[PDB]
Ligand binder design. Structure first.
Ligand SMILES: [Zn+2]
Length: 197
């Protein structure tokens, strides 16, 4: 009833990476290593790098799923709020209830789990292009952390799983997410609060 969040590199040395975007007022997505937390604006591009030490087999996939970070909310499905699920902002592929979308990948598949009712989005694991050492997935988060009747100010984690063609686990990583109007300021504030504590 709760997806695992345990970091697991597995046989292929799977782990995430994030750009260094800074904390200027104009930044739309920024990652805090000290907090392991991504701060982003609503429906803006969030580049997430995938790093491996060796190439996984053909048919390997990469799945993203959100869960509530607090244990007392972890069994509740993370979904878009009653406003955003009805705002007709469909990209033609993501169900309107799904918080997490993949941008610019026609091979993305969206799952409503028949047993847990949780949402996820999964893409093929592509090898790095010539001249690159990693691959990047562009995610979008489609509600604010503050949306009433949805996340309702509760923090979430995104869990990224590397899976074989049957869906079996090959690797796992995760990060907290705050979707907010001013990610640069909020990252600075939370990093200062951590330093003071
Ligand atoms: Zn919303």
């Amino acid at each position: 009833s709760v997806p695992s969040q345990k970091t697991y590199q597995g046989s292929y040395g799977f782990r995430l990476g994030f750009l260094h975007s800074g904390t200027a007022k104009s930044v739309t997505c920024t990652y805090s290593p000290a907090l392991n937390k991504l701060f982003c604006q609503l429906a803006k591009t969030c580049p997430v790098q995938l790093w491996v030490d060796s190439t996984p087999p053909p048919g390997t996939r990469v799945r993203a799923m959100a869960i509530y970070k607090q244990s007392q909310h972890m069994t509740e499905v993370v979904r878009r709020c009653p406003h955003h699920e009805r705002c007709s902002d469909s990209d033609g592929l993501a169900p309107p209830q799904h918080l997490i979308r993949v941008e610019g990948n026609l091979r993305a598949e969206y799952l409503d789990d028949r047993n847990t009712f949780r949402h996820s989005v999964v893409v093929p694991c592509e090898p790095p292009e010539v001249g690159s050492d990693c691959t990047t997935i562009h995610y979008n988060y489609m509600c604010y952390s503050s949306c009433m009747g949805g996340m309702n100010r509760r923090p979430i984690l995104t869990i990224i799983t590397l899976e074989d063609s049957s869906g079996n686990l090959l690797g796992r990583d995760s990060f907290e997410v705050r979707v907010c109007a001013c990610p640069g300021r909020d990252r600075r504030t939370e990093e200062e609060n951590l330093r003071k504590k």
